[model samples]
Target: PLESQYQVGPLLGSGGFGSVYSGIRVSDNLPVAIKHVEKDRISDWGELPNGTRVPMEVVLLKKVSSGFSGVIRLLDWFERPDSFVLILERPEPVQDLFDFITERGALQEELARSFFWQVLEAVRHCHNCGVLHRDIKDENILIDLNRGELKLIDFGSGALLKDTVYTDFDGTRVYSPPEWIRYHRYHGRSAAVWSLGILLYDMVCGDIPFEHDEEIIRGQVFFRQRVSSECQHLIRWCLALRPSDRPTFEEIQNHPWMQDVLLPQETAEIHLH
Candidate 1:
């Protein structure tokens, strides 16, 4: 007796854990991301503050649900004989930022700034909730093309937060800050701030700033396109090799480029299909 009423639909995406499906709750017609994981893939378990468990992703999601809006929300979950299903909130007209970037080449600064601010808010929220979204790459971010809205997702590589020294790396290497590779351990906020810099480069330059680890380690920035100086300043500020020099989230929010920006009128017509 699963005791669930969700009607699963087509496959939405798949990863190391399992596949996610588009689902609708029969009772309210509410849409969801049904994550189905094989039993053997999940071995350990412990109860979380929100009644989830040791798969820290589930635990972290549940912890942040009440106060966060820029990240995906966990609605409910159920278990089958062979697999466990996680019911996740699905934002309408959602598409991953990587695909959207691929189709559009590069986004304007205003557009990129708008989305990045939302990401900063989400990251700050996670930190405040004692969670660390160790993985913060474009692929983990969902974008709503019509509204230019953003949602952070894929918490599989996250960690419970603290004044900790982390060495177990799990995110996209390209997005990893230099200190992590150089010293094998780094703080949460600095690494997150560094990833933001990489993300900014990807959004405005249409490519990663570093082609290889050495380049990132060397900390040489070569802009392929003309973008605002303020934007460039924030990027370098965030990518500072010394974590102490990087801007805090409060500073990030107060940066000149982040205030009073607007998206271009033609953005709604950008076809992501």
Candidate 2:
């Protein structure tokens, strides 16, 4: 039973697949997160040697968990006939990136720069491990405000990558690349870049670039704020119409905006403002 080792608390949040709750380990009183979801919510499934079904999220998290920073760690899990429960590490003094943005109303170029690079590194790490976190959004990222730490979480929409085209773009429509919207096909790496582009825009602008699917498909983004030029260029570069035009995650880490620190003379400018 969940109560055996964990004293489940209030609902932390909810998504299409499940609900997360605050929990504490009975033995050590360590804070943890408990997720409860129905079996049908997760579409991807794996099988053990005995042929019992398990969630691909669980499998992927377990697979890449070793020695990876900036990722939520899975503490334990329980499988019932109808629902699955996942125990996760709960980082205290942290806020969801979405809430962080809501309170601060966009972030400084330096701060956003830090977060963007960390998330890129985390995603790159996942891809290298043959895992794709299909859903990359502000809501899925946690920010430790005081320490400027970040962690990528909520892998319920993740899947394995095999160097093939994925037909179903199951993540948020706005973050998907134009080709995925038009043709319903995308490579994992390019799609990740597209989502990172949207993430960058969201961090600096306090809103996404596009609202409707058609606008995203059009791929014509107009920035409203006056952020730093290179940061603006980075967003436009990542939101290219063709997937090939988008930089690979590695290239993004090397981009000028990612690499250069602002001089003392240029500390008070934000392109989006």
Candidate 3:
């Protein structure tokens, strides 16, 4: 149920494609988040809706939400000419890695490793289950009720990557891969792995490693940066030029950082890719 009167509250946050709000279900005293995606150029940057999707994203979410739990749980949805509202399970306010980085200076190696490994598990679950979170950024990652645990939210750009090639000039500019910046081709494993590697490096070192040289930064520096001998050597490999060179999810899981310890049946991160 929504608010006793179905009242929406102050906005929680805004993303490139949508904004989320706090709402209450007075009868049950439960709180929920109502995500509103504006129609037209405001939210989606002028990209018109596709596939009978009128902003509810119901059909798309139902299509791909089998194994992933970190995705915003779609509750009830509604449509109007200008906007669509999605009711979601609200967790405590999420803390992004950006804030974490700022607060702690640079994430220490220990916490950084744990956080990075958790992200891999979540991404692996999504890949195995047929969901492709086309957008993975610090803003999309969330902190869960359990202290230090992570979660993924924001399905506005969520996709089902079924070996299909897509060409979208999307994703965060600074974090986007070189091929995406230059050629505008989309491959799941490759793009995702590259972004994750950048994310990993960014987490450990307060800045993005590849952006130092605007000229030489054509994704090659991902290899040249000289990754330290950690359990995560192959992250550099995943960030390679061709999609063929990218490491698969399983390979990342088996990589040293994420050794064979059991992750929860629940989502590895409260926020994920």
Task: Specify the highest-lDDT model's number.
Answer: 2
Per-model TM-score versus the true fold: 0.88, 0.91, 0.78
Best candidate according to TM-score: 2
Which of the predicted structures, 2 or 3, would earn the higher TM-score when compared with the native?
2
Across 1-273, the per-residue lDDT of candidate 3 in tens digits comes to 334445788987644445778887665656778877776733332212354545424555554455445555666677677867777767665566666666655555555667777777667666766666766766777766344566666656656666777687455666667677777776777788878877787776765666543522455544333345763465566667677887777777677766544343233342231
For each candidate, what is the lDDT?
0.80, 0.82, 0.63
Q: What are the runs in model 3 whose C-alpha is more than 4 Å off?
A: 1-7, 14-18, 42-52, 64-68, 145-147, 212-217, 220-228, 260-273
Q: Between which residue pairs do clashes occur in model 1? A: none
Stretches of candidate 1 off by over 4 Å are 1-4, 14-18, 38-46, 50-53, 80-83, 262-273
Kindly list the per-residue Cα lDDT of model 1 for residues 1-273, writing each as its tens digit: 222688878888545445988988888988788877676665434467656444666777887887547888888766677766778888787788888788778888767877787788888888888888988988889876566667888777788887869888877888998988888889999899999999988999888898688998999898999988999998999899999999988998898988974442334444332
- The predicted structure with the larger TM-score, 1 or 2, is 2
Q: Per-residue CA lDDT of candidate 2, range 1-273, in tens?
A: 778888989988645445889999998999898988788777889764366679988887876687857888888889988988999888776689898788888788887887787788788878887889999999999865445567899888888877888987568887888888788899888888989999999999998999888998888877777688888888988998888899988788888899864422233233211
Worst 10 residues of 2 by lDDT: 264-273
Cα error of candidate 3 at position 36, Å: 0.9
- Residue 31 local lDDT, model 2: 84
